[PDB]
Structures are given as C-alpha cells and as structure tokens.
Design a protein around this ligand. Structure first.
Ligand SMILES: CCCCCCCCCCCCCCCCCC(=O)OC[C@H](COP(=O)([O-])OCC(O)COP(=O)([O-])OC[C@@H](COC(=O)CCCCCCCCCCCCCCCCC)OC(=O)CCCCCCCCCCCCCCCCC)OC(=O)CCCCCCCCCCCCCCCCC
Ligand SMILES: CCCCCCCCCCCCCCCCC[C@@H](O)O[C@H](CO[C@H](O)CCCCCCCCCCCCCCC)COP(=O)(O)OCC[N+](C)(C)C
Ligand SMILES: CCCCCCCCCCCCCCCCC[C@@H](O)O[C@H](CO[C@H](O)CCCCCCCCCCCCCCC)COP(=O)(O)OCC[N+](C)(C)C
Ligand SMILES: CCCCCCCC/C=C\CCCCCCCC(=O)O[C@H](COC(=O)CCCCCCC/C=C/CCCCCCCC)COP(=O)(O)OCCN
Ligand SMILES: CCCCCCCCCCCC(=O)SCCNC(=O)CCNC(=O)[C@H](O)C(C)(C)COP(=O)(O)O
Lengths: 459, 52, 56, 88, 178, 69, 175
C-alpha cells in the first residue's frame, strides 16, 4: 500500500519545487500516473481481503473508492486552473497542496485496518476541505457554510470517538479482522441502544441523512468547483463505507434500531426530489439530488442484505462520477455568465452543441438509464427493499418519477428554448472543458462492461 | 481498461464452476442428493442433552 | 546542453522514486510477517530440492 | 424544394388583386397609395375585412395592434415585405 | 408586434377586435366558404344595427353582452394560422436563429472562408460605432425630463443620422434562418 | 440564391473531437493488433491434470496468456 | 462437443425428421442454405483451420487448483483465531461451490423449458423437482444469514433448526 501513499506524498515537494508555469502540467501528469498505479488494486481474492500489513488492507469495497479518489484528483486540477489564473504562484501551490493532502487522507482512510486510525483520518479530511471552502469560495456565505460543515460533522463524530474507545476497552481490540471474527450479538438494553446511536450518527450525518442534511447545500454551493467535486464524489461516501464497516458488530439490534432512519431516508428522498423541482439555483439542485441518492444508499445499508450492499456500492461509485460531471457542467456556465441562476442563460444548445451533448449524457446518467451502473445499483437496492417489504415499491417508483422529472427539467431549462438576447459573452467551449467532461463520462460507460469491479465484497 | 479486462481470475469463479461440475457429477452418478440441508456434519455437533 | 534542462526538470523523478521506494518498503513489510510461511494446514507443502522458501 | 422566394412586385400585385376583387372599391379608382378611409370612403369594418382578406391571401395573421394602421395598399405591402424578410 | 402599445384600448378598438374574433370563430364554425360568407354578412348586418349609437352607456352594455355571447358560443378548437402563437409551427424555427455577435468568435480559419461577407460586416460595425453616440444624444434631447411616457422611438432628423436603437431591429437573424 | 448562414463556431468542438479520437486510436490500435496477434499465434491454454510429484506456479492456474503474464 | 461433460449438461438424443416434399415447387430455404454454406461456412471453417494450425504449434497447459480439507468451524475452540480463519475460508469456498451448483441446476431447467416447446409443463418435471430439492437445501443452508454472514452464523442457524426438529420428533414419539 506504500506504493500508492509514497508517490502521493512526493506530489507535495514536486509541486513546491516546480516553476511558476509548470505546476498544473506536472501535478496533472503525476496524478494521472498515480491513478494508473492505484488501478492495480482491483485484483481481489474473493474469500478474504488483501492484507498488505498490520496497518493497511484492501477490500473489494475499498478498491473502487480508492481508484475513484485517485482519478478524481486530476479532474479537480483540470477544473481548478481556469478560475485560479490570476492567483499568485504561492497561493496556487497552497491550493494544490490542499488537494494533495485531501487525497492522502482519503487514500489512507479507506485502507486502515483499525477503527481509531480510520476515525483520525476521517476527521483529518475536514481541515483541507474547510480551508478550501473558506479561502477560495466566491461568495460571502462561504464562512457560514464552512461553520455548518464543520460543526454538523463534529457533533456526530465525537460520540463515535467515545463509543470506539469504550468498545476497545470492553473487547480488547478495534482491528477490523478481530472485530469481525469475534463478533457477539448486542443485547436489547438502553446502554446498547446508545452505543448503536453513537456508532451510527456520525456516518448518518456524513451521508447526509434527511433532517441532518442542511450543511450540504451550503457547503456544496458555496465551495469552489474542486471543493464541490470532492464533496459530492468522495466525501459523501465516507459515511457509507463507515456504516458497512461498523454494522458488523451492531447485530441484532439494527433489526429495529433502523426503523426511524429508514422512514427518514425514504420520505426525505421523496422530499428532496420534490425540492429539486422548485430550485432557482443550479448547484442547489445537484446538491439535493445528491441528498436523494445518498438517502437511497442509507436505506440499502440499513436493510443489511448482500444485494443491498452490492447496489449501495454501485450507486456510490456512479453517483460520485455523475455528480462531479454535473458540478463541472454547471461551473462552465457559471464561468461564462458569472451567475448561478438557472433561467439567466437559456437555449445554450444553439450556442454550445457539444456541451449540450455532455449535458444530455449527464442528465441521462443522473436518471439512471439502463444499462448504466446507476440503475444497476438503484435496481439492486429496490429489489432488496422489496424483499424487505413489498410496500417500498410505491416510494421507489415515486422517487424514480420525480428524479426523471427534475433531471429533464434542468436539461430543458438550461439547454432548450431560445437564447437570452442581452447575454453576448458566451465563447466557444475550450478543449479543457470538453476533455474534463469526456474524462468524467467515459469511465462511467466503460464500467458497464465490467460491473463486478464496483459491486463490492458481497459479489 | 485492457489491464482490468485481462485481470487474472483470482476471484475463483472458473475454479468454483469446475468444482461444482465435479461435485454434481459425483453426486448424481451415485444417486446422492445434490445438496444437504445441513452445512456441517451432525456427528461433530453436541447439542444440549435435554430440551425440557 | 543538459545542465539547464536537468536543473529545470529534475522534479519529474520524485514520484517514480517514491513509487519504487514504496514497493521496496512493501516488500520489507512483507518480510516481517513470515511466521506462518509453509505452516498453514491448507497450504503446507514439501519444498522443492533447490528452493529455500515458498514465498518471499 | 419549397415555394420560390417572395418578391415585392408579387406582393404588390397580389394585394392589388385582392383589393380589385372587393366590391366596394372601383377597379379603375384603386391605386397602391389610395387611402382606404379618405379616398375610397370606407369605414373601420371594411378595413378589418380587408385585413382578414389579406391574412387569408398570404396565409399568416397580422396582429390587431399593427393592422389598425394599414390604411393604404402600400403600407400592407411594406408590412408583408418586412415580416417575411423580402428585400427585393 | 412592431407598434408601441397605448395605455389603454378605446371602445372603438375593442369593438373592432370583437368583430374580428367573432368573424374568425364563425369561420371556424362555418367550414365552407359560401355558408361562411352568408353568415358573415349576417354578422356584419347585426353588427351595423347599432353602428350610430350615441349613448356610450348602452353601447358599453351592448359590447359586454356581445362579449358574453361570443364567450358562450366560441369555437373550442378555432382555426389558427401555423405561425401564430397557437399554431402548429409557432416557434419551430427558433432553434435555427443564431445571434450575429457569434460571428466575432469564429476562428480565423473559418473567416478565411467568406471574406467579402466579413469585410461588409466590418463596414456595418464601423457604421454602428460611429452612429451610437449621435443616437444617444438624440434620445436624450427628444425625451421629457420625467422619463419617456410611451415605448415610441423617434426617427432620424439630421443628414447622416440613423434612427436611435436600430442595431437589434435591423440585424434580426431571419424568419427562416436556415 | 445562396445566403450566408449565421452559425456558432464549430472549429473548436471539431478540433477537440479530432484530438480525442487521435489519441484514443494512437494508443488503442496497437493494443487491438497485439491482442489479435496473441490470440491467433499464442492461444489459450488447455486443461490438464497435475503430473505426479509436480507443483505448478501460481500463474499456471489461468488459461489466457495475457492474464497469465 | 466433447469440451463440456455431457453428464453435468445432458440433453435428449435430438430426434429430427427427414424431409418429405409434397410439391414440385422448389424449396427456397434449401437453396438459401446452400448459398449460406458455400459463402459463409467454408471461409469461416478455413480461417478456423488456419487458426488451429497456428495454435497447435504452441501448446501449453493450465491446471485446476486443488484445496485440502481443513477442519471446519465446529471443531475450533472459542478464541482460536487461526483455526477460525481457516474454517471461515473453507466455508466461503463451499458457499461459492454451492452457488455454482444451483447455477448449473438452473441452467438445466432453462434449457429444458426452451427445448421442450409446447410440452415443457410435462417434459420438464424432473428438472423442476431437481431444482426444488437443491433450492430447499440451499435455502436451509444459507438463507436469512444476511450481510456480514459467517460460518458461525450458519452453524447457529443449523443448530436452531436441529433443536426444532429434535423437539418435534420427541413430541411426535409421545403420540
Ligand atoms: C445502441 C446503439 C449501438 C451503436 C454501436 C456503436 C456505438 C458507439 C458509441 C460509443 C459511446 C458514445 C459516447 C458518448 C459521448 C458522446 C460522444 C459525442 O460527443 O459525439 C461526437 C460525435 C461527433 O458528432 P458531431 O457531428 O461533431 O456533433 C455532435 C453534437 O454534439 C450533437 O450530436 P448528438 O445530438 O447526436 O449527440 C451525440 C449522441 C451521443 O450522446 C449519447 O448520449 C450517447 C451515449 C448513450 C447514453 C449514455 C448513458 C445511458 C446509459 C447507457 C450506458 C451504455 C454503456 C455501454 C458500454 C459503452 C462503452 C464505452 O447523442 C445521441 O445520439 C442520442 C443519445 C440517446 C442514446 C440512447 C441509448 C440508450 C441505450 C441503448 C443501448 C445501450 C447498451 C447497448 C447494449 C444493449 C443490449 C444489446 O457524435 C457521435 O459520434 C454520436 C455518438 C453515437 C451515439 C451512441 C448512442 C448509443 C451508444 C451507447 C453506448 C454504446 C454501447 C456499445 C455496446 C454494443 C452495442
Ligand atoms: C432530524 C433527524 C435527527 C436524527 C434522528 C435520530 C433518531 C433517534 C431515535 C432512536 C430510535 C428508537 C430509540 C430506542 C428504541 C425504542 C424507544 C422506546 O420508545 O421504545 C419503548 C421503550 O419504552 C419507553 O418508551 C421508554 C422510552 C421513553 C422515553 C424516551 C423519550 C422519547 C420522546 C421523543 C424525544 C425526541 C428524541 C430525538 C431528539 C432530536 C419500548 O418498550 P420496552 O420494551 O419496555 O423498552 C425496550 C428497552 N429495554 C429493553 C431496555 C427495556
Ligand atoms: C464519438 C464517436 C462515437 C462513435 C464511434 C463508436 C465506436 C464503437 C463504440 C462501441 C464499442 C462497443 C464495445 C463493446 C465491448 C467490447 C469489448 C468488451 O467485450 O470487453 C469488456 C472489457 O471491459 C473492461 O473489462 C471493463 C472496463 C474497465 C474500466 C476501467 C477504466 C479505467 C479507470 C479510469 C478511472 C475510473 C474512475 C472510477 C473507478 C471506480 C468486457 O470484457 P469481458 O467480456 O469480461 O472479457 C472476456 C474475455 N476476457 C475476460 C479474457 C477479457
Ligand atoms: C450533528 C447532529 C448529530 C447528533 C448525533 C448525536 C447522537 C450520538 C449518540 C449518543 C451520544 C452518547 C453515546 C455515549 C457513548 C456510548 C458508550 C456506551 O455505550 O456506554 C453506555 C453509557 O450510556 C450512556 O451514558 C448514554 C447516556 C446519554 C448521555 C448524553 C445524552 C445526550 C442526548 C442523547 C440522545 C441523543 C442521541 C441521538 C440524537 C441524534 C441527533 C439528533 C453504557 O455504559 P455503562 O455505564 O458501562 O453501562 C453498562 C454497565 N452498567
Ligand atoms: C362564431 C361565434 C361568434 C359570435 C359572438 C357574438 C358576436 C357579437 C354580436 C353583436 C355585436 C354588437 O352588436 S356590438 C355594438 C356596436 N355598437 C357600437 O360600437 C356603437 C358606437 N360605434 C363606434 O364607436 C364605431 O362607429 C365602430 C362601430 C367601432 C366602427 O368604427 P369605424 O367605422 O371608425 O371603423
């Protein structure tokens, strides 16, 4: 695992020793090389995980997330360099350093064998994101957004720390292998109920769960493009990964402790899909769609079936890629017209046809068109829910209908109709933007040929 | 993508198929059931002696 | 002719050297977990006439 | 292909044709610049009927706010030419 | 579409608009030309029955009753011209209309083709740039201090003057731009 | 008679498409040719019993030559 | 062909009728079949012959990996991590093998349904009962274990079923 971590660390002195006009080129090239190297972790053994050492291990769940992070870094660099052109060399190097530190913390988080190290890195991811949002955000609400993002996370995460140290004291270990092999049932008691809550609420708020999701629109809208990319693509999946790791020791309590969370997730996915229908800001719609998809992931994790975990893993990967692509698409238009209002710029298909094609493909993947992996995950989760209870199909179908509705609503509003007359500064699409959209979309379609790479350990 | 497509079958699916073929052939060649409702041998299980 | 281009492009070796060093450290870490080499009931084997270890 | 491009001469000839097929107008008396209210002694209802006849002739509707001011054949020809982008 | 609207419609304008709407809906009801002509002359006679009324109150009441009759007896599916706001071809060619400022973003290799067109476009741009200041000055001169009262614009009055605010009216893309 | 058609600039999208196709083909045509040559001249292995007293290498439990390599 | 075992994947003797023409009109399907043969099946056969000639010059083998039988989870003491790990690996391997067995039986059922045509309801009863037996066994073995399954949970499920069956048998013995 050091063969991935050490080059990521080497990215720091390499970008701090580069010339003022070569930082983007060097960082992009070596980030792509690191992603290529990290692609070798997909070879999984089946029966058990790849245990490199006492500190790190790789699973069929961790490997797609690691590859997604390593692949997302170069796309973040490509998206960032346009709006940072006027910045000084030192501040651009600091921004790239923030991105590299975030990547390092993420790659170490997904491979830790022990839960305290996972917690330490999972909290350490906060600082670079907070710095990025509050320093390179564009509006004045970035400060309030950063405060929300920090405190919503910490209020859930601190009880997790207390629960983890208590569990290590009572059991003697927190190593995930020992945790799994020496699992014992949780009795029906108030102490066990509060232990369950302390082990669950941090990952709940990172998803986010409906009712604890208010930080996400603020943080995702007010962050720069790279910050939004990493928030939607990767940082939302930390909660799901933590849930999959932690629910091993929570049985059989989850059988009834999951009822309020399932109810909240289903009704709130309906609510957020409905909210997307009346939104004046283009980024907030994407944020709320992310909330709905993560609510579906929460249901999948809560029901505790192999098909549910497979669908949840597929949906996490697909949602990460699709949300990153949608955020980049919105950012291109924002850079054109310097406003996030959806109806300001209309009929962009007449002026930008290839970008309209990218918009159409992203909208089609957002509504989970077959045989894309988005629908693979969603269908697996829906089938698992149907096995859990036949009445879930009503809510699943309603959510599907509303998702198609607002996806095509966004597409029609932004791309169709007639152009706004007074707006006359819409230049032809750059090679960088088209390449960024292609690099987002092509892995999505290529993953359809080999769906088992992202289905997870339960495959 | 080429590297991922040509990844060696470490997941043991072809091996599992061949093992299943061998087991099925052996079991229906002798009239034995294809699968037992008991995963582990009842002879190595020591249940509590009294149930009442 | 190569002095100046080396001085302005030497940064392109840091990441490959880090990769090589990481592989080397991974092998060293593997070297510390040989307690059960050729000792598992499933994979215990008789050594070949010339081989010294089953894996390294 | 579709119909040949329209020309100013054709528009004027068709307008004069429609107006000469109107009974309340003398064919000899009628002229391109002949005012409807003043020279032909017509009223507003006759102008509305003329506008409707022009719409039926050219297969397109003229809004009431614009049709109110078409008081001579030349104005109708100019309106039709400018709407269908006829420049020669 | 081309004329600046007034603050309100007179009784005469409302009367003519009701006449035209009634005639069009009657034509929708009366498909054939001869029957439509017969009933249109009947409508014209009934309409001229109160042509010379002097009491404005009773004329207004007649107009209201006629509007109620039209609404009750209107055609639910009246004939609409294809390019009209309700027609089947209303906004069909809007996707083919590209604004003229997009031609400035063309690559020089694209402008290598069509050289004379772009030279004439340069001529038009110089004309607009040399007329804009005079247009603004004329608009400032011919405007009351309390702002404009209507949406009407004055014509050119000098030797080499162009009517103010003419660029986006003259440079419409087309009605069939492709 | 011929009139000018006002269109947005198509040079840049076409150039991006040519560049992407060029690089993808530059890297993927040699791979396709190599895969075809390997498949034609070095076929897949065929299942055989393990000979007496012989222990195979770990890569000898797979049949495609590329996967074996 | 002989590539796959015909006992694991059996099929009926494939009875086909002989053509018995009743009219002097020429059969277009036969002429089209001859054209297809001469234009497609011969070049493809020649290309395959050349490919096999090239393959014969380079012959190498790959082997099926054999796994020893290690003690299962029933004969591991409560806190012996190594025996537990090896038993769990063996149990997971057996789970995969059982999944593949069920897959083979399902393939047999599907092939029977397609082959028998309009008489599948009568001529596929044996495949149906085979699938019923294997499905019941697989369900009893592995159903309701949920995610995070293990050999210990399978053993607990088996022991619960054994206790229920023993109680039922004992209460029937007194009847
Ligand atoms: C199914 C047909 C099979 C055809 C075989 C070959 C297909 C090769 C295509 C490869 C993938 C396309 C890449 C997408 C990026 C866009 C490319 C682009 O920018 O265009 C530049 C290029 C240059 O044009 P231009 O003149 O310069 O101007 C273009 C303008 O921008 C504006 O131009 P535009 O308006 O025409 O837009 C471009 C185009 C491109 O935009 C797209 O949306 C195309 C992508 C489809 C939707 C993607 C998400 C939906 C989920 C499906 C996931 C499938 C993945 C399978 C694996 C893919 C491997 C990468 O949009 C469309 O044509 C309409 C989209 C509607 C697609 C509906 C298909 C639904 C599912 C059909 C079956 C899918 C599974 C196949 C097997 C099923 C069981 C047998 O235009 C094109 O070449 C058009 C692309 C061809 C259309 C492909 C549509 C179907 C293909 C789907 C995946 C292929 C599966 C192959 C497996 C075997 C079958
Ligand atoms: C906006 C989104 C925020 C996040 C949402 C988090 C959801 C947290 C809710 C937790 C789910 C349930 C908690 C415990 C399960 C049962 C609770 C209780 O009502 O059940 C009965 C418990 O009986 C009584 O109801 C006791 C609880 C009454 C006091 C709790 C106050 C509830 C009022 C609601 C306050 C809002 C809480 C959330 C604040 C934000 C069951 O009867 P009994 O079998 O005998 O007791 C079982 C426990 N034993 C085994 C130890 C004996
Ligand atoms: C713009 C112009 C468009 C028009 C031109 C279109 C041209 C034609 C397009 C249509 C092509 C259709 C191709 C259909 C597939 C053919 C090849 C396919 O069969 O191979 C697949 C191979 O797919 C790959 O295995 C999966 C794709 C891997 C994707 C990895 C992307 C690289 C990482 C990038 C970053 C990812 C970030 C997110 C990751 C989580 C499936 O392999 P499989 O049938 O099994 O192999 C059998 C034989 N083997 C096993 C010995 C090989
Ligand atoms: C940003 C919003 C996120 C909010 C999430 C907050 C919820 C976190 C879950 C509860 C936090 C406290 C959990 C305590 C750590 C668990 C350790 C444990 O299990 O110890 C219990 C101790 O249990 C407790 O003490 C829990 C009491 C609660 C203390 C603080 C209460 C604050 C409010 C609690 C309810 C809210 C929690 C869920 C709300 C989610 C957010 C709305 C039993 O230990 P023993 O004493 O040894 O008993 C056995 C031997 N006799
Ligand atoms: C097919 C279904 C449609 C049926 C709906 C019903 C139709 C309506 C039926 C009867 C309508 C009436 O009587 S409506 C009553 C009409 N009476 C008046 O308007 C009195 C004052 N007249 C004037 O102000 C002008 O002379 C003016 C007439 C405007 C002409 O103006 P010009 O000369 O300057 O063009």
């Amino acid at each position: 695992m050091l063969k991935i971590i050490i080059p990521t660390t080497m990215l720091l002195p390499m970008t701090w020793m580069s010339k003022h006009n070569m930082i983007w080129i060097n960082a992009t090239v070596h980030s792509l090389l690191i992603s290529l190297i990290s692609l070798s972790l997909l070879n999984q053994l089946g029966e058990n995980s790849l245990n490199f050492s006492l500190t790190f291990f790789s699973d069929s769940l961790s490997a797609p997330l690691l590859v997604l992070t390593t692949w997302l870094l170069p796309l973040m660099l490509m998206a960032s360099q346009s709006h940072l052109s006027k910045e000084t060399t030192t501040r651009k190097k600091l921004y790239i350093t923030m991105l590299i530190l975030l990547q390092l913390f993420l790659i170490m988080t997904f491979t830790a064998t022990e839960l305290i190290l996972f917690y330490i890195l999972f909290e350490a991811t906060l600082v670079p994101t907070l710095i990025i949002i509050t320093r390179w955000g564009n509006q004045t609400e970035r400060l309030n957004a950063g405060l929300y993002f920090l405190f919503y996370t910490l209020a859930g995460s601190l009880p997790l720390l207390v629960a983890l140290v208590y569990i290590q004291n009572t059991t003697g270990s927190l190593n995930f292998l020992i945790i799994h092999y020496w699992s014992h049932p949780l009795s029906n008691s108030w102490s066990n109920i509060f232990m369950w809550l302390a082990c669950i609420m941090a990952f709940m708020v990172k998803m986010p769960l409906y009712g604890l999701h208010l930080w996400l629109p603020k943080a995702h809208v007010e962050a720069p493009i790279a910050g939004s990319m990493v928030l939607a693509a990767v940082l939302l999946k930390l909660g799901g990964y933590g849930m999959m790791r932690i629910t091993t020791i929570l049985n059989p309590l989850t059988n009834y402790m999951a009822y309020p969370f399932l109810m909240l997730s289903m009704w709130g996915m309906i609510m957020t899909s409905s909210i997307c229908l009346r939104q004046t800001d283009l980024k907030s719609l994407i944020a709320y769609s992310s909330v709905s998809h993560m609510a579906l992931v929460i249901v999948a994790i809560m029901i505790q079936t192999p098909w549910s975990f497979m669908g949840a893993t597929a949906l996490m990967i697909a949602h990460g890629l699709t949300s990153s692509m949608l955020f980049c698409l919105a950012n291109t238009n924002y850079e054109r017209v310097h406003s996030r209002t959806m109806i300001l710029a209309r009929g962009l298909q007449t002026l930008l046809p290839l970008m309209a094609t990218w918009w159409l493909v992203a909208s089609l993947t957002n509504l989970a068109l077959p045989p894309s992996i988005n629908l693979i995950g969603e269908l697996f989760i829906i089938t698992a829910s149907f096995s859990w209870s036949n009445i879930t199909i009503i809510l699943m179908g309603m959510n599907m209908m509303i998702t198609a509705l607002y996806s095509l609503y966004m597409l029609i509003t932004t791309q169709r109709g007639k152009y706004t007359h007074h707006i006359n500064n819409i230049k032809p699409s750059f090679t960088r933007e088209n390449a960024l959209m292609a690099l987002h979309i092509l892995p999505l379609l290529l993953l359809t040929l080999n769906p088992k790479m992202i289905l997870g350990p339960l495959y | 993508s080429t590297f991922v497509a040509y990844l060696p079958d470490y997941r043991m699916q072809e091996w599992a198929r061949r093992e299943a073929e061998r087991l099925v052939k052996y079991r229906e060649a002798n009239g034995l059931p294809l699968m037992e409702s008991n995963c582990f041998d009842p002879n190595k299980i020591q249940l509590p002696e009294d149930e009442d | 002719n190569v002095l100046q281009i080396v001085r302005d492009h030497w940064v392109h070796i840091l990441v490959p050297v880090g990769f090589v060093f990481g592989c080397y450290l991974d092998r060293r870490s593997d070297e510390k977990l040989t307690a059960f080499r050729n000792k598992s009931l499933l994979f215990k084997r008789e050594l070949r006439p010339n081989e010294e270890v089953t894996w390294k | 292909s579709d119909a040949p491009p329209l020309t100013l001469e054709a528009i004027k000839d068709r307008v004069l044709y429609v107006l000469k097929l109107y009974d309340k107008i003398d064919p000899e008396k009628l002229s391109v610049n002949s005012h409807f209210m003043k020279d032909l002694g017509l009223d507003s209802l006759d102008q509305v009927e003329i506008i409707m006849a022009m719409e039926d002739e050219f297969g397109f509707e003229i809004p009431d706010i614009d049709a109110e001011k078409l008081m001579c054949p030349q104005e109708i020809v100019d309106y039709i030419a400018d709407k269908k982008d006829v420049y020669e | 579409a081309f004329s600046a609207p007034a603050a309100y419609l007179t009784h005469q304008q409302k009367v003519l608009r009701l006449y035209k709407r009634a005639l069009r809906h009657l034509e929708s009801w009366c498909v054939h030309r001869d029957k439509y002509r017969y009933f249109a002359c009947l409508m014209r006679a009934r309409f001229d029955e109160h042509k010379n009324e002097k009491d404005m109150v009773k004329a207004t009441q007649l107009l209201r009753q006629a509007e109620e009759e039209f609404w009750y007896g209107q055609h639910p599916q009246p004939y609409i011209f294809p390019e009209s706001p309700g027609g089947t071809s209303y906004e069909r060619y809007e996707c083919y209309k590209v604004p003229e400022w997009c031609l400035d973003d063309w690559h020089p290799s694209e402008k290598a083709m069509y050289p004379d067109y772009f030279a004439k476009r340069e001529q038009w741009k110089r004309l607009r740039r040399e007329s804009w200041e005079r247009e603004v000055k004329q608009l400032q001169e011919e405007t009351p201090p309390g702002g404009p009262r209507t949406e009407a614009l004055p014509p050119a009055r000098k030797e080499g003057d162009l009517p103010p605010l003419w660029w986006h009216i003259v440079t419409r893309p087309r009605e069939r731009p492709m | 008679k011929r009139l000018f058609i006002i269109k947005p600039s198509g040079f840049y999208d076409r150039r991006f498409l040519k560049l992407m196709r060029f690089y993808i083909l530059l890297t993927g045509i040699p791979v396709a040719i190599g895969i075809t040559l390997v498949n034609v001249f070095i076929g897949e292995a065929e299942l055989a019993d393990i000979p007496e007293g012989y222990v195979p290498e770990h890569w000898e439990y797979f049949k495609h030559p590329i996967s074996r390599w | 062909p002989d590539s796959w075992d015909k006992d694991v994947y059996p099929e009926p003797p494939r009875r086909t009728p002989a053509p018995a023409p009743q009219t002097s009109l020429p059969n277009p399907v036969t002429y089209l079949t001859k054209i297809f043969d001469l234009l497609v099946d011969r070049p493809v056969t020649l290309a395959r012959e050349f490919i096999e000639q090239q393959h014969a010059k380079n012959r190498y083998y790959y082997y099926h990996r054999e796994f020893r039988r290690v003690p299962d989870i029933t004969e591991c003491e409560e806190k012996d991590i190594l025996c537990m790990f090896e038993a769990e690996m063996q149990w997971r391997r057996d789970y995969k093998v059982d999944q593949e067995i069920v897959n083979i039986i399902q393939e047999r059922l599907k092939a029977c349904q397609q082959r028998e045509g309009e008489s599948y309801r009568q001529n596929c009863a044996k495949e149906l009962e085979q699938f019923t037996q294997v499905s019941k066994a697989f369900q009893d073995r592995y159903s309701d274990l949920g995610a995070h399954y293990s050999a210990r949970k399978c053993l607990a499920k088996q022991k619960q079923r054994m206790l229920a069956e023993r109680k039922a048998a004992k209460e029937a013995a007194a009847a």
